[PDB]
Structure formats: C-alpha cells, structure tokens
Design a protein around this ligand. Structure first.
Ligand SMILES: CCC1=C(C)/C(=C/C2=NC(=C\c3[nH]c(/C=C4\NC(=O)[C@H](C)[C@H]4CC)c(C)c3CCC(=O)O)/C(CCC(=O)O)=C2C)NC1=O
Ligand SMILES: CCC1=C(C)/C(=C/C2=NC(=C\c3[nH]c(/C=C4\NC(=O)[C@H](C)[C@H]4CC)c(C)c3CCC(=O)O)/C(CCC(=O)O)=C2C)NC1=O
Ligand SMILES: CCC1=C(C)/C(=C/C2=NC(=C\c3[nH]c(/C=C4\NC(=O)[C@H](C)[C@H]4CC)c(C)c3CCC(=O)O)/C(CCC(=O)O)=C2C)NC1=O
Ligand SMILES: CCC1=C(C)/C(=C/C2=NC(=C\c3[nH]c(/C=C4\NC(=O)[C@H](C)[C@H]4CC)c(C)c3CCC(=O)O)/C(CCC(=O)O)=C2C)NC1=O
Ligand SMILES: CCC1=C(C)/C(=C/C2=NC(=C\c3[nH]c(/C=C4\NC(=O)[C@H](C)[C@H]4CC)c(C)c3CCC(=O)O)/C(CCC(=O)O)=C2C)NC1=O
Ligand SMILES: CCC1=C(C)/C(=C/C2=NC(=C\c3[nH]c(/C=C4\NC(=O)[C@H](C)[C@H]4CC)c(C)c3CCC(=O)O)/C(CCC(=O)O)=C2C)NC1=O
Ligand SMILES: CCC1=C(C)/C(=C/C2=NC(=C\c3[nH]c(/C=C4\NC(=O)[C@H](C)[C@H]4CC)c(C)c3CCC(=O)O)/C(CCC(=O)O)=C2C)NC1=O
Ligand SMILES: CCC1=C(C)/C(=C/C2=NC(=C\c3[nH]c(/C=C4\NC(=O)[C@H](C)[C@H]4CC)c(C)c3CCC(=O)O)/C(CCC(=O)O)=C2C)NC1=O
Lengths: 160, 49, 160, 161, 49, 26, 65, 160, 161, 161, 161, 160, 161
C-alpha cells in the first residue's frame, strides 16, 4: 500500500518518514472514503462487468473461443471468465490499498511465465482487461472512472 | 617400487577418465618431495621407459 | 622500513600513528647508527663473503657444476656469483630499513616464479642463502650478528 | 511486512472473496486513526535522542550494568546500547504507522533472542529499558497515542522475553 | 596459504568478465551471471524482473 | 571402450613393466 | 552527480595470489557520494588517476544534487 | 521536493510513476496555494520572528551570551541571529517545496561537523529553532501552524 | 535532477535572498500548470507501447534501416531500438512532470552521443523517430500538453544532434 | 610511497652499487632528525581539530566564501572543507614523518587539481587555508619543526596551484 | 559431484588398488549405455518447457493448489513453481548423463526439505508433479531411457519425501 | 559456433581447451561436409519450402490471413513469407555453424518484444516454422532430417 | 569474438543473403585446415612454459632489462613478465583455433598499449619477446602451423607497436 511503500522507502534510507511522505499518507487516509466507494461500485456489480467484458472480448477476439484457441469449450470459457474475475478482484484490492503492490505482488509478477506455460495469448488477456475497464469506467462518475482506470491501466500496462 | 607402481596407476586412471588432470595435480609439486630422497633424472628415464 | 609500515597502517585506519608505533620508530632510529656501521662492514668484505659462501655451497652441492646442472658453464657460474652479490646487497638494504620491506619488495615477492621460469632449483637457493649467512656472520661481532642473522633467515623463509 | 490495509487485503484474498462489510469497517477504523498515527510519528521523530537518553536515565544509569562487570560498561557497549534502543524506538514508530506488528517480528524479533543470548546481553534489563522508553513516549504523545505506541512496545518486550 | 595442488584439483569456477569489446550475447550471459550471483536465483526469465 | 581395452592391457601386464623399469634403473 | 573518471590501477597482489587478469585502465562513471572512497581506494592500491571530470553535476548547486 | 522524490523513487525502480504517487503530486499541486500563504506569513514577519526568538533563546540559555560562550559580544550575537535567519529561510524553502529535501540538502547534512568545528553547542541551536517555532506557530492559524511546525519539527529533530 | 520548484529555490539560495515576488509568480505558474501535467502524464502512461509502435510505424518501418545492412536489422537491434524509444518517452514524461529538463541532460543526454557514435547508431534516424513520437503524443494529449511535451522532445533531439 | 631510507636504498639499487659514504651520511642525517620528527608528529596529533579550526578562523571565516554564493556556503560544503583541511594536515604529518614528499604526490596531489576544477572549488582560497594551517602549526611545534612541516605544506600548495 | 567413471576410480583409489576386471566391466557398461544417455539428453533438452507444462497440466492444474489459498496461487508462486520443476528436470538430465545421483543429493536434495518446510511448500504435491514429469518424459524418450530417467526422478522424490 | 563456444568456455575458466573439447571441435570439423550438404539442400530448394510452408500455415491458421489478422492483404502476406525466409536463412546459418548461436544471436533474442510491438501472434509464427520443418525434413534423408530438425526444433522451442 | 564460421555467417547475414558458393568455399577451407589447427593447439598446450622460458632465454635474459634499472628487474616484474608472455601465447593459440584474430583485438589489444605506456613497460622489448616466442613455436609445430601461428603473433606485435 501507500503506508508500506513509504515505510520501506524511509526504512532503506535509515531515516524516519519525511514530512512530505507524511502528508502523502494523510491525503491517502482522507481519500480512503472515496476509495471505499469505488470499491463498493466495483464489488457490487461484478456479475455485469465480467459478463459484458467477456461478451465484448469474445466479440473482439473470436479466435480464442474458436476451436484451436485456449478458451474453447464450456469449462475453458468458464476458466477464462474466472481469470477475468481474479483480475477484477485484484483491481478492487489495488483500489482500496491506494497502490498497485497488491495487484503486482499477487497477480502480475510471473504472469508471462504462467500464461506461456498454459499456452495463452497475453494480448487477448490485455484485451479482456481493456473490456473490463470499458465496462467499469462506463459504470461510474468521472473522477471515480479516472481513479479506477489508473489501476486498470496498470494491469494492461503490466501485461505488455 | 611403490612409486613406479603409482605413476602407472594414475596413468591408467587418467586414460579411463579422459583428462590428465589427475596426473597433473599430483606429480606437479612431486619433484622437491623426492629431490632430497633420490635422483630425479633416474625417475625421468624410468617414466620414459 | 619501520616508519613506512607505521605510516601505511595508520593510513589504512584513517588515524595518526599512535604512541607505541612512534616509540618503536624512536627505538629503531636511535640504533640506526649501528646499522650504518654493519652495512659498511658488509659492503667492505663482500668479495670474500661471496667467495667462501660459493666454496661451501659447492661443497654441499657439487651437482650444479657437474654435467646437467646450472653451474656447468662459466657464464651461468658468473651469474651464480652475481646472484650471491645481489642478495648480499639486499641484505644490507633490509638491515638499513630496519625491516623486511625493501628486500621483500625488490627481491622476494615471487622468487619462485622467477627461478621456475629459469632452471635452478629453489632448495639450492635455500642452501645458498644459508651459506651466505654463515659467511657474512664470520665478519661481524655478536652485538651486530644479532641484527645481521635473522634477515638471512627471513630470506630462507621466503625462499621455501 | 504489511500494514492493516495489506493484512485485510491478504485475508480477503486468501479467502478469495471480495471486500465485505467487516473489511470495510476495519479499513474505516484505520483511516480514522491514521491522522493521530501521523502526528504521533512526527512527535516521536522530533525527540528520538531525548526519549532514548531519558530511558537510560530512568532505568540503566547508576545501576550495576554501567559499573565494571556490567554488559553496558565500556564506551563501545554504551554506544551499542544506545544504538539498540534507537532501533527499538524507530521500529515501534514504524509499527505504529503501519498499525500492524508484522515488521517487528519480521525485522526486530527474528534472531534477536539468540543474538542477545550469544552475546551475553541481559534481556530483563533491556526489557526494563524498553518499558521506560514506552513510559517516556506515552508521557510525550498523550494517552491514546501512548497506548497505541505501548502495544507495539509490549510486543517487542514479549518477543524479547 | 592454499597449495596449487589443491587449486588445480578443484571445481573450477567460471569468471564472467564484462569487456566492452565483447559480442552481444556475451554481455547478455555476463549480465545473466550477475543477476544470478547477486539475487541468488536468476530473477529474469523466472519472473521477468 | 578402446580406452578400457588399453587400460586393461596395462593393468594385466603392469608387473613386467615395473620389472623392466627395475632393471633399467638399478 | 557523477564523475567520469579514468584511472589505471595495477594490483601488486596477483603474483602472490596467482589469480587471473582483470584489465586495468578503466573509464567509469562514479556516483558523487562514493567517489570519495573510490578515489581513496585507487590511491590505496597505488594506481594513478589519469582524468577526473564532472559529468552530470552542473557544479555550484545547493539542492537538486 | 515532492515531484523530485516521486520521480527519483520511480526512477531507481525502473518504472513509471504509480497512480498513487500521481495523486500525491496532484494533492501537493492543489495545496500549493496554502503553502504559498504560509510562506508569505513566514517571509513578511521575519524581523519579529528572529528578534523575539533570539530574545527568548538568550533568556532561556544565557550562558552562550555570557563571557565564555560562543555568541558573546556584538558581532557574535549578530552572527547568531544571522544563523537563525538562515534556518528560518530554509524553513520557508521547505514549506514551499512540500518536503524537507531543501532543508536537509542545504543546511542539515554536516551541521554537527560544522558546529563542532566552530565550537557551538548544538542543543542551544535546537532551542533557537524551538523559540522560532514558538513565535512562528503563535503567528498563524491552526492548520497553518501545524504545517509549518512539521518543518520546524524536522529541523529540531535533525539537530538532535 | 531538479523540478521548477527546486530550481527556483536554488536560484534564491545561490542569491542568498528570500523568495521575492518573481519567484512567487514562477511557482504560481507551475502550480497552475501542474494539474494539466498530471493528466498528460497519466494519459501518456496509458499508451506507452502504442505511442512507441506508432512512432516506428511512421518513421523507421519499411525503410532501409529495417532492411539488411541497417542498424535496426536484427531482432536484438529491433528490441534495443524499442527499448531506446521507450526510454525517450519515459524521460520526456518525467521532464514534463518536473517542468525542468535537468533530468534529460543528467540521465539521458549525458553520454548518449558518444554511445551512439561508438555503436554506429544513426542519430538522424533516431531524431526522426523521436520527432514522430512527439507528433503522436501531441495528437494524443492535445495542443498545449503536446506542446509542453514537445519542448522536452525537442530538448532530447537537440542534445542528440 | 617511500621515506628517506627507501629512496636512498632505491637510488643505490638503481645504481646497483652498495651503500657508499654519501648514502651513509644521508641516513645519518635522517636518523638524527627522526626524534624531532616523532615529537612534532605527536604534538600535531594532539591538536588536529584545533589547528584546522584556527586555520579556518584565520582565512576562510567571515569572508565571501562562507557567505551565500561561496563554495564553502552550506553545511555539507563546510563539513567537506573541514574534511579536506584535515586531510592536508594528516598527510603533511605523514610526509614529515617519512621525510619524503612521495606520499603527497602519490595520494593527495594525484587527481586533486582536476577534482577541484570539476567541482568548482577555489584553489587560491584553499591554498591560503593550507598556508594558515602551516602558520598555526609552525607556531605550535617551534621553528625548525615548523620549517620541516612547512616544506611539505609548500609542496601541497605548489602541487595544488 | 562424480559420474560412474569418477566413482569407480574413487573406489579403486580408496582401495589403493589398480583397476581390476570388475571395474573394467562397470566402465564397459557405462561406455555401452553412454550413447543412449546422450540421445535421451538431447531429446530432453529439446522439450524442457513442454515436459514441465504437461506435468503441471497433469497434476497441479485445476486442483486446490492453483485456487485461492493454495501455495501455487499467485503469479509469483506459479513462476517459482515452474522454476522448481525446470530445476528438477534439468538436474535429472544431469544425473542421467553422469550415471550417478551424487549431483542430486549434492545440489538439489541438500537443503531442499528444510527450505520447503520453512516456506510452507507442499511436498506431496511437488512429489506428484515430479512423478508426472517422469511419466511424460518416459513417454517421450522410450522405455529404457525413460527408466534410467525415472530412477533419478525416484531419487529426487525419495530425498524430498 | 562450436569453436567460439569452446574458446569462450575455456576463456572464462582461465584455462586452455580441454582435450574433450578439442575432440569435440575435431568431430565438428569432420562433420562439416555433411553440414554443408544439408546447407545446400536447404539453400537450393528455398522457394518450394517457403511456398509450401506458407500454404500449409494459412491452411492451418486461417485467421491471420482473414481480415482482422496481421498478415491480411498482398504486401502483408509478402512480408509474412519474407519473415519465413529470414528464419529459413537463419536455419541454414545454424546448420553450417554447428550451434544455435547464429540463430539465437541474430533472430531469437528480442523476438517476443518485436512481434508484440508489431501485433503478431507468436504461436502462428511457431506454426510457420513447424510447417517449414515438415517440408524441409520431408526433403532429406533420415539423419539429415534429424540434424536439420534439431535447429528447426530450437527455433520453435525459442518461440514458446 | 568470432571464428571464421561466425564471421562468414555475419557477413552473409549483414547482406541478408543466403550462403552462396564463396561462403561455402571459405567454410570448406576452414574445415580442411581445422585438423592441423587442432594438432598444433595440442602441441602448443604441451609446451607452454618451455616456449615462454625459451623466448625469455633468447631475447630478454642477460640484457639490460633484467639488470638493475630495467623494467624486468625485480621478481615481481619477472613474474608479471612471464604472466604477460603466457597470455600472448595462450591468446595466439585461441586465435589460431578460431582462425580469426577478433579475440586478439577484443581481449588482448584493447587497452594494452595504454596500460604498457602508463606502467612504463618497453613495447619494443616485449615485441621482440613475442617474436622470439613465435620463432620458437614455429620451430616446434612445423612450417605451415608455425606460419598460421605467426600471423596472429604478428597481429599482436602490430597492435602493440
Ligand atoms: C489472481 C492471479 C491469478 C491468475 C491470473 C491465475 C490464472 C490461472 N489461469 C488458469 C487457466 C486458464 N485461464 C484461461 C484464460 C484465458 N484464456 C483466454 O483465451 C482468455 C484470453 C483468457 C481469460 C479472459 C484459460 C483458457 C485457462 C485454461 C488453460 C488450460 O486449460 O490449459 C490456471 C490453471 C487452472 C486453475 O487452477 O485455475 C491458473 C492458475 N491464477 C491466479 O492466481
Ligand atoms: C634482485 C633479485 C634477483 C636475482 C638474484 C635475479 C637472478 C637471475 N639469475 C639468473 C640466472 C641464474 N641464476 C643462477 C643461480 C644459481 N644457481 C645455482 O646453482 C645456485 C643455487 C644459484 C646461486 C649460486 C644460475 C646458474 C643462472 C643461469 C641459469 C641459466 O643457465 O639461464 C637470471 C637470468 C639471466 C641473468 O640476468 O643473469 C636472473 C635475472 N633476478 C632478480 O630479480
Ligand atoms: C544555511 C545553512 C548554514 C548555517 C547554519 C551556517 C552557519 C555558520 N555559522 C557561522 C558562525 C556562528 N554561528 C553562531 C550561532 C550560534 N551560536 C550560539 O551560541 C547560538 C546557539 C547560535 C545561533 C542562535 C556563532 C556564535 C557563530 C560564530 C562562531 C565563531 O565566531 O567562532 C559560520 C562562520 C562565519 C560565516 O561565514 O557566517 C557559518 C558558515 N552557514 C550556512 O550556510
Ligand atoms: C536512459 C538513457 C539511455 C539511453 C537512451 C541508452 C541507449 C543505448 N542504446 C543502445 C543500443 C541501441 N540503440 C539502438 C537504437 C537505434 N538504432 C537505430 O537504428 C534506430 C535509429 C535507433 C532507435 C530509434 C539499437 C539498434 C541498439 C543496439 C546496437 C547493437 O546491438 O549493436 C545501447 C547499447 C547497449 C545495449 O543495448 O543494451 C545503450 C547504452 N542508454 C541509456 O542509459
Ligand atoms: C586525501 C587526498 C584527497 C583530497 C584532498 C580530496 C578532496 C575532495 N574534496 C572534495 C570536496 C570539497 N572540498 C571542499 C573544500 C574547499 N572548498 C572551499 O571553498 C575551500 C576553499 C576548500 C576547503 C579549505 C568543498 C566545499 C567540497 C564540497 C564540494 C561540494 O559538495 O559541492 C571532494 C568531492 C567529493 C566529496 O566531498 O566527498 C573530494 C574527492 N579527496 C582526496 O582523496
Ligand atoms: C536447484 C536445487 C534447488 C531447488 C529445487 C530450489 C527451490 C526453491 N523453491 C523455492 C520456492 C517455491 N517453490 C514453489 C514450488 C511449489 N510449490 C507448490 O505449491 C508446488 C507443489 C511446487 C512446485 C511443483 C513455490 C510456489 C515457491 C514460492 C514460495 C513463495 O514465494 O512463497 C525457493 C524460495 C526462494 C525463491 O523462490 O526464489 C527455493 C530456494 N532451490 C534450489 O537451489
Ligand atoms: C532475421 C530475424 C528477423 C525477423 C524475424 C524480422 C521480422 C520483421 N517482421 C516485420 C513484419 C511482419 N512480419 C509478419 C509475419 C507474420 N505475421 C503473421 O501473421 C505470420 C504468423 C508471420 C509470418 C509467417 C507480418 C504480417 C509483418 C507486418 C507487420 C505490420 O505490417 O504491422 C518487420 C517490420 C517491417 C520490416 O522492416 O520487414 C520486421 C523487422 N526482422 C528480422 O531481422
Ligand atoms: C590478456 C590480455 C592482457 C595483457 C597482455 C595484460 C598485461 C598487463 N601487464 C602488466 C604488467 C607487466 N607486464 C610486464 C611485462 C614486460 N615488461 C618488460 O620489461 C618486458 C619487456 C615485458 C614482458 C615480456 C611487467 C614487468 C609488468 C609489471 C609492471 C610493474 O609491476 O610495475 C599489467 C599491470 C598489472 C599487473 O601486473 O598484474 C597488466 C594489466 N593484461 C591483460 O589483461
């Protein structure tokens, strides 16, 4: 989170927290209410986000659902929507924590090695998170969509 | 008599092993161990023989 | 020398030389005059010292003069004598610095590499320096022989 | 190394569940206490050396441990003792800011007992020194900030004992 | 002091030198060796870090 | 297998090699 | 801030330890904070320093390194 | 400043600025108006701050102005008030920059070595900044006094 | 490495003067442009790989440099070219956020000409690639944010040439 | 790095000759002056910080270089200046003990001009500071020990200029 | 670290004896199997990632360990699991080439149990993963090369359990 | 090549070439004639290899030539066959050199970054090299097909 | 670092062309000379120290450089000279095996002139030592292997001069 990152960055430097880092933690502490509102917005409507994003993804990239692709069949499409659900859950964690160390430290480090061992195109996963971002920022107000799109932006950036 | 055996032993071990390092790491510093003992060119013509 | 060792060690630990090191410097610099006298006496008689040491070395080892050795031809034999003279010069240098420092820096760091790059064995050099030791000890008194002897033994140590 | 937020996220992730109302309430509790944590951390960063030297002046000075034979005798041992107490105060400040003592048993209490037992450091005297440090900083920052400092000071004393 | 008989008879370790003249995969393998030595495990190709 | 053949030949006849060395040297 | 230094450091210990060779006479960017211990260390080993030049400093500033 | 610190902290990590750091820079950018108001408050009344703080310091610590102390005499007391003026100027710089890297990077790194080479008690300098903090936070509103007292707090903390 | 604030403070400190009205006006100018800088930095962080690949698709693709004999020929050279262009875009974003190009000549333009001249890298082709990157990102973020990006892109092209 | 003894031995060795009477006379001169060198080195080791702070109080204090804009302005620059002057006094003590200035051009004067010219350090002001340090230590240890200190101080000032 | 040849030589040397007929027969057995060992090592070097991903697809995928709460859950843990399985296959190839499992207990099985017990890694699930890797590579290289691979795979599973 | 790899591997170890490495270089030197025969087989029939492999690839993976794929259109299909020609040329280089350091050191290091920047599915490129391997090993004798399929195998392995 | 094969492949790749008949003829020339290169490399690996000591016995012994004042005087300098000559013979063997002198100017002749000019090493005397080493090894391995050794020895002497 923000507090972990500030504590570690002051911790290597053998110093206390600088006052600028302290008002950073203070501003994050005050903005936590809007962060929790964005988290409830993302949590309560996860069904429609995953459904509409999977629909728009398979409309956009039909070869992965065609015979020959990875997510072909009933259980494979269910696992594909499950992976999208995992990434939306990590998006909610990163929205609450105020930083991307939950998202990176859980589901972005060895994502290329894992999806290469599974035989998955990672660009189609980036398109899945892109459609999730489109449905999610179509669901909120302006600054809320920008603050959630920052973390969605980080996930698609960490894909490629 | 033991050393005239032993040279042949580590020659045989080197021949099977494929690298002469087993000979090298032993008989490199061997000369001043046995120079107070004996005649060194006698050992040389012994190994040549 | 002694003052070079004190200065270099104090230069490591970023400090001035302490009182014990400086008092050792004083104790060498007080008795430097006896050292100047014994280096005079070694510079005087060096022809006969090298001469009797050569005689006793080829008493101990007639192997080198005889066929297949290093003292076979008189050019190499003249260099055997010149090696003896250089080592006695380095003994006087080691006496006058009060320590092993210039004699090791000029003639002892890597004698093994040189005399294996040439053909003469190093135990022969050990016996040669011991012959030089009892040769040079017959020309000084005990008050100076106690200062002369252990430099020859240090050469004997760094040879082997 | 995790604060209250990262531990809440780790619990909800090990569940695999979304953040329900209890997690929201825990994060609201941390986001209410965070400003007090910030101000207490600034006040403790103000007076590091004063709190350390008042802790030694309360407990360790004029006792047997600063006399000959004590483990705090020499100037090297005195400087290392001041260093150890500065470490305890600094990491208690970090654990106060995070709101979770995971940094304390990750980075202070890991091999500290075995180190102190190998060196011959008295554990009871340093526990009393940490307790006096806690008493001084609770006199410094007030009642409730002193309590939320003293919970991590008691964590350090419990892991040391 | 370690005798040369002990050193030539040893598990000889590859020393990775970074010269600017080198070919490009050589600088790649040397940087790989530095990532392996400092981080104790090859952190690129196993995490893409 | 050729290295083993020459090693077995050397082992099987090491005594006469050492004896030839013995009256070569002494 | 960084110093683009150029120096030549003979070892004087390779004969005793019998190690393999590192090429001396290097040209490197040293950071400003540890350029001190680096220059001092090059003087410890006895090596001559050919050229010291401030690379990224813009000398005479007070903040901003 | 805040932007320098965020850029450097993302720069070592070989990554871009994380969105949490970006809203940190955004919040500092919005709070810059109040920072400039605190800076004008500290700048316009520097005469009374330095005068009253020097008066309260010499009332509190009279030995440094007594014969035998550092700041004894006319020019020494003038240099003492000049050093206090330097520290109030660095306080204003740290108030504007939003972080203590101006204060630390100008006048707090070798402060112990400098004031030990001058023969100055550093605790009395900490008392000087304490009286400056008392006069300055007696001059502002509540949150303004807290935000200025953070940097005054950093200076007195970096003294001892 | 200094932003507009640190350079203003450094000028007022090298003077030894307090912050007068001109420094206050400069800092007010930076504190007005900072929100636009933040939003342009977020928009550029959105589309790093797209801006880089559109810059190669505009300038370097289908020319001689991707053909045999060119310096962008092999896959190693192509990957290093994409890496160099990502560096230019990332540091131009940093210099846009700071509002001062000190990071560019501190950390990009320091030994870049001598490196490119030792490797055999064409400087004109990479200057055209940076210019197309500037054109693409100015089409992305608008007129004035594109201009305040293009001033640092022109700084990189001027220091490279 | 060589004292008077090692330089005499190096001259007699580069000749290849034995130590004749002139070398004996040079070593007798060094062995007569060595006790005075020892006592002056102890007296200088007594008062390192006092000699340094009196040199700054004579030359560099209350001038423009400690004012804003000077190169001795900040506390970092003041601490580095005290460090540089302590280096000059320490190495002048070493060269006094050895009786040979080879350590000065080996380990002080090697890259010092280029370092000071790259940093922007004034060479004339630091030469005046070393001259005042020489004047203070020659007032400390007497006439002839002050002279044999001042020959190496003049060596440092000549190599710096 | 020793192959069949070095272990035979070490036995004959610890005896102090020459190489008798039993040692000659052991070395003839190794020199007959060596070409098959070479071809199996080339075939295994062909399909490292395929054998690893088929082992995960057989055992570890779609079970609880890739679900939340499992030790193979996160992408970091998945990448470290693929790394561990690549290590097991690589060292089993080395022990197949040497014809002696001394490298396995020298360099894999040395502190592996204590590492996995400290991390919380399930040993039974990784033993099943190594068994599926063995089954896949024995389907790859044939009957007898698969058997002489599976003896070292069983050595790794026995030392792990 | 083999000689480069042996020289470098002895070069880091500060030793000469071991005799086993020397008979490795000797065996490669003797097998160079068969390597040159495989190279002439691959060089002389490159037209039919590229044509038939492109035909079988677009039969196998028709979505990349369908509108929406990368290699859609005349010039895009020509560039696709050109990339296949590049990889067959690197196959010939690796066949002659006796090792894969030409193939890896020219066209396999940043292949994922390049084909991700172009928008290309890398699995379809692996299928292209698979069809090239099928046509090429359908063109030779048994051991020649195995020796060429080793390098084709390395290229498809280095893709995924 | 590239042999004849890698340089031929690099030329054909920088062209972008396939391997035509001239490249096939160059590789046939290397594959005919390779067995002679192998046997000469074994014969040179046999007698490294003998070739080095015969080169010193021909050129550098009994001259002024082994006398006092020479750069080969001390035992440290003698050992470093033997080390330098062993380096020249070893890298000439490597360049003979590769059939390309790219390793010589990559790893010997890179900073060798500036190193020798900074140390005070005579370049003409070491060029004569390398020439005598070439003469001795050409007497050792024969006419044509001595010639293909002497081309790289002349390369080292030309880059050194
Ligand atoms: C929280 C971090 C995290 C992630 C991301 C994760 C992914 C993950 N995805 C899997 C499978 C999968 N994931 C996908 C997903 C996709 N394929 C496509 O074509 C689409 C582009 C895409 C989704 C939209 C598919 C098809 C599989 C099945 C692979 C197979 O059966 O071989 C599996 C193996 C089976 C299992 O245990 O679920 C894991 C562990 N696990 C994690 O812990
Ligand atoms: C300053 C320190 C130092 C020394 C002493 C030194 C000696 C030295 N001795 C040499 C040869 C020699 N040295 C000896 C010496 C001996 N043979 C014996 O049997 C005795 C044990 C021993 C002395 C009595 C002989 C016989 C040669 C000629 C070897 C040859 O045939 O090349 C050579 C090569 C040719 C020459 O310049 O003379 C050097 C450089 N080098 C140095 O750097
Ligand atoms: C911006 C960062 C910065 C600081 C802090 C700074 C301090 C500084 N303080 C000085 C003197 C001084 N500063 C003091 C100050 C004090 N003595 C006391 O007793 C009081 C506790 C205290 C002030 C309230 C005194 C007495 C001197 C004169 C020392 C002397 O004359 O020996 C001097 C030497 C003369 C000069 O050039 O001004 C410097 C450089 N310079 C800087 O660039
Ligand atoms: C952060 C500041 C910074 C920069 C910018 C930087 C650049 C840099 N670019 C390099 C190479 C390169 N740069 C290029 C780029 C180009 N060549 C072309 O033909 C195009 C015109 C142009 C790209 C638009 C290429 C092709 C190489 C590889 C050269 C080679 O491998 O031979 C290298 C050689 C070492 C290596 O690849 O990893 C460095 C150090 N280093 C830095 O620290
Ligand atoms: C042991 C031999 C040796 C010496 C002498 C040496 C000097 C040296 N002095 C330095 C800086 C300095 N030296 C000075 C000194 C002065 N400037 C002035 O205005 C005064 C006239 C003068 C002091 C009397 C200052 C102010 C700096 C800091 C420059 C800066 O921080 O920008 C630096 C820059 C790096 C660092 O501070 O730690 C070096 C390497 N290094 C060595 O290895
Ligand atoms: C060459 C000999 C050798 C081996 C084998 C080795 C293993 C090893 N595996 C590790 C972790 C791991 N190993 C696994 C593997 C597994 N967990 C599961 O659930 C699966 C059942 C199983 C894979 C089949 C995982 C998930 C981790 C990461 C643990 C963590 O990050 O918390 C670690 C922890 C440090 C690090 O990841 O980089 C080591 C040292 N080290 C060695 O030097
Ligand atoms: C020798 C090592 C090497 C390789 C591999 C290489 C590839 C390479 N492929 C390119 C394009 C391409 N390569 C392909 C190839 C394919 N797309 C598909 O769907 C198929 C699966 C596949 C081929 C069978 C396509 C479609 C393009 C055009 C991409 C575009 O126009 O955006 C380009 C850009 C245009 C150019 O200058 O040619 C390069 C540099 N260059 C090299 O130096
Ligand atoms: C692998 C490529 C390579 C080479 C060749 C190399 C040479 C090299 N030779 C050196 C010294 C030396 N080289 C010589 C050699 C000679 N002086 C003479 O008088 C003779 C004419 C000549 C020998 C034939 C000597 C005497 C020194 C020592 C200089 C000294 O200690 O002052 C040094 C100084 C540092 C050290 O000794 O360990 C280097 C780096 N380094 C390398 O990385």
């Amino acid at each position: 989170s923000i507090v972990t990152k500030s504590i570690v960055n002051a911790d290597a430097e053998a110093r206390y927290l600088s006052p600028g880092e302290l008002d950073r933690i203070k501003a994050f502490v005050t903005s936590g209410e809007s962060r929790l509102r964005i988290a409830e917005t993302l949590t309560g409507s996860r069904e429609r986000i995953i459904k509409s994003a999977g629909d728009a993804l398979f409309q956009k990239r039909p070869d992965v659902v065609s015979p020959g692709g990875n997510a072909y069949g009933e259980e494979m499409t269910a696992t594909c929507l499950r992976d999208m659900d995992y990434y939306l859950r990590l998006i909610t964690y990163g929205v609450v924590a105020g930083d991307v160390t939950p998202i990176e430290e859980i589901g972005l480090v060895g994502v290329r090695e894992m999806y290469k061992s599974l035989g998955t195109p990672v660009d189609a996963v980036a398109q899945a998170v892109r459609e999730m971002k489109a449905v999610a920022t179509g669901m909120m107000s302006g600054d809320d969509a920008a603050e959630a799109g920052a973390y969605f932006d980080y996930v698609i950036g960490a894909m490629e | 008599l033991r050393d005239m055996a032993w040279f042949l032993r580590y020659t045989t071990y080197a021949i099977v092993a494929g690298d002469p390092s087993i000979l090298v790491v032993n008989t490199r510093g061997l000369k001043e161990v046995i120079e107070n003992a004996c005649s060194i060119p006698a050992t040389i013509v012994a190994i040549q023989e | 020398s002694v003052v070079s060792q004190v200065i270099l060690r104090a230069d490591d630990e970023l400090r001035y030389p302490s009182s014990g090191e400086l008092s050792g410097i004083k104790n060498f610099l007080a008795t430097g005059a006896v050292r100047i006298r014994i280096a005079e006496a070694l510079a005087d008689n060096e022809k006969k010292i090298v001469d009797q040491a050569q005689k006793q070395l080829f008493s101990i080892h007639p192997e080198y003069r005889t066929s297949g050795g290093n003292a076979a031809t008189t050019k190499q034999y003249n260099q055997c004598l010149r090696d003896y003279g250089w080592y006695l010069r380095l003994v006087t240098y080691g006496i006058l610095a009060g320590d092993k420092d210039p004699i090791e820096r000029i003639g002892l760091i890597g004698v093994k590499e040189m005399y294996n790059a040439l053909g003469v064995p190093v135990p022969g050099m050990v016996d040669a320096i011991r012959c030089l030791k009892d040769a040079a000890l017959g020309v000084l008194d005990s008050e100076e022989a106690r200062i002369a002897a252990p430099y020859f033994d240090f050469i004997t140590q760094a040879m082997s | 190394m995790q604060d209250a937020i990262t531990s809440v996220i780790n619990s909800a992730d090990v569940q695999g569940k979304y953040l329900d109302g209890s997690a929201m309430d825990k994060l609201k509790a941390y986001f209410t206490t965070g400003a007090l944590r910030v101000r207490a951390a600034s006040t403790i960063s103000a007076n590091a050396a004063a709190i350390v030297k008042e802790a030694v002046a309360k407990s360790l000075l004029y006792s047997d441990v600063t006399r000959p034979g004590g483990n705090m005798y020499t100037t090297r041992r005195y400087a290392a003792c001041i260093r150890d107490l500065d470490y305890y105060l600094r990491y208690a400040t970090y654990a106060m800011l995070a709101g979770d003592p995971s940094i304390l048993d990750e980075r202070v209490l890991n091999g500290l007992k075995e180190t102190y037992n190998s060196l011959g450091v008295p554990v009871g005297s340093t526990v009393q020194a940490i307790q006096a440090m806690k008493e001084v900083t609770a006199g410094l920052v007030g009642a409730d900030a002193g309590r939320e400092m003293g919970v991590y000071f008691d964590y350090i004393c419990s892991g040391l004992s | 002091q370690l005798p040369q008989s002990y050193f030539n008879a040893a598990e000889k370790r590859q020393k990775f030198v970074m010269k600017p003249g080198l070919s490009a995969l050589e600088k790649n393998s040397v940087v790989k060796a530095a990532y392996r030595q400092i981080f104790e495990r090859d952190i690129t190709r196993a995490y893409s870090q | 297998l050729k290295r083993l053949a020459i090693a077995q030949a050397i082992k099987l006849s090491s005594q006469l090699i050492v004896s030839r060395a013995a009256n070569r040297i002494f | 801030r960084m110093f683009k230094i150029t120096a030549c450091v003979p070892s004087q210990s390779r004969i005793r330890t019998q190690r393999e060779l590192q090429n001396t006479y290097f040209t490197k960017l040293v950071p400003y904070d540890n350029w001190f211990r680096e220059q001092q260390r090059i003087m410890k080993m006895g090596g001559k320093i050919v050229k010291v030049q401030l690379a990224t400093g813009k000398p005479g500033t007070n903040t901003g390194l």
